Amino acid sequence: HHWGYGKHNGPEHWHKDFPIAKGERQSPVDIDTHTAKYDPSLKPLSVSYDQATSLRILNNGHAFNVEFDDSQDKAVLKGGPLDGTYRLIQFHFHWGSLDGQGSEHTVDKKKYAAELHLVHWNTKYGDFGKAVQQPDGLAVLGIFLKVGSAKPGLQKVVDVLDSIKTKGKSADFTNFDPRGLLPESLDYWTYPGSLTTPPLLECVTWIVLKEPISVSSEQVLKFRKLNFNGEGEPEELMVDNWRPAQPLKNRQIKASFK
């Protein structure tokens, strides 16, 4: 057996193999907009994805990862609450079976249809492996997805999903520009958290954008055609691969805007 999002291996079961699931800085969390406080110490956020080099897209049995070449400082995230440079390594999404759910973070308890996670690691630690052994090893830029108008920049991702329907399948995915997945505004909320999937390591500085991007019903419907299962096995649609909000505990969510 292995962790997943089913009734028998879902979020409520994770703590048995990953005790940190009940830790002090777990993610995601509900973002109470009225309790979040504007933080003047936050520096301007810098998303520099101009030289991003995508390589492959993979169905890992939980979601699909668009992987990037992080052997050189190309796609980096800096500024904001971040100290130093964080390099983009991959991005993936979390989505629901219906438009009314799918996101991991929530805003005033509101759930979006999906959530995009752009994962970056602190270059001061040399590699991703070492970074996840540090309290400030990672920075994940989270972007909410709502259903409405199509997102042109997402279509290339959608059209390749048919080739990676099942767990373990991958496909070349070069020259994809992640800048086409960003909303207009970079206003955000930030707080110290963790990976939202096992191992649930608490090494993440979360930066969640306030402005969601709009994707079409057709685009998200194709996300829902993916499979959690591997080839030749009974079909288990890849839907609702999101972890619910976790206790905030000793943390404050800061806003980059007034």
Ligand X SMILES: NS(=O)(=O)OCCCCCCCCOS(N)(=O)=O
Q: Which residues bind Cl ion (CB under 5 A)?
A: 6
Shortest spacing between CB 181 and ligand X, in angstroms: 14
Binding of residue 197 to ligand X (CB under 6 A):
yes
Q: Please give the C-alpha separations between residue 87 and each of 58, 106, 116, 154, 203, in angstroms, as whole numbers.
A: 19, 26, 17, 21, 15
Which DSSP category does 237 fall into?
Answer: B
Is residue 197 marked as binding? yes
Residue 161 interacts with, from Zn ion, Cl ion, ligand X, none (CB under 5-8 Å by kind): none
Distance from chain centroid for Cα 115: 6
Interface with ligand X (CB under 6 A), residue from 82, 140, 154, 239: 140
Binding of residue 103 to ligand X (CB under 6 A):
no
Residue 213, classified by CB atoms within 10 Å of its CB into exposed (0-12), middle (13-18) or buried (19+), is buried
Q: Which is nearer to Cl ion, 95 or 144 (CB)?
A: 95
Q: Residue 139: which of 102, 96, 188, 100 has the closest Cα?
A: 188
Shortest spacing between CB 38 and ligand X, in angstroms: 25
Q: Which is nearer to Cl ion, 6 or 247 (CB)?
A: 6
Is residue 123 marked as binding? no
Binding to ligand X (CB under 6 A) within 48-87 occurs at none
Angle, CA of 251, 133 and 248, to the nearest 5°: 15
34 is catalytic: no
Amino acid letter, residue 24: E
Binding to Zn ion (CB under 5 A) within 62-121 occurs at 117
What is the distance between the alpha carbons of residues 106 and 103, in angstroms, rounded to a whole number? 7
What is the DSSP pairing of strand 213-215 with strand 138-147? Answer: parallel
Residue 88 interacts with, from Cl ion, Zn ion, ligand X, none (CB under 5-8 Å by kind): none
Kindly indicate which of the ranges 30-38, 52-60, 126-134, 183-191 contains the residues binding ligand X, using the contact rule CB under 6 A: 126-134
Kindly indicate which of the ranges 14-22, 125-133, 207-215, 222-230 contains the residues binding ligand X, using the contact rule CB under 6 A: 125-133
Q: Which is nearer to ligand X, 119 or 213 (CB)?
A: 119
Using H for helix, E for strand and C for coil, what is the string for 10-60? CCCCHHHCCHHHHCCCCCCCEECCCCCEECCCCCCEEEECCCCCEEEEEEC
Q: Where on the chain is the footprint of ligand X (CB under 6 A)? A: 117, 119, 128-129, 132, 140, 195-197, 199
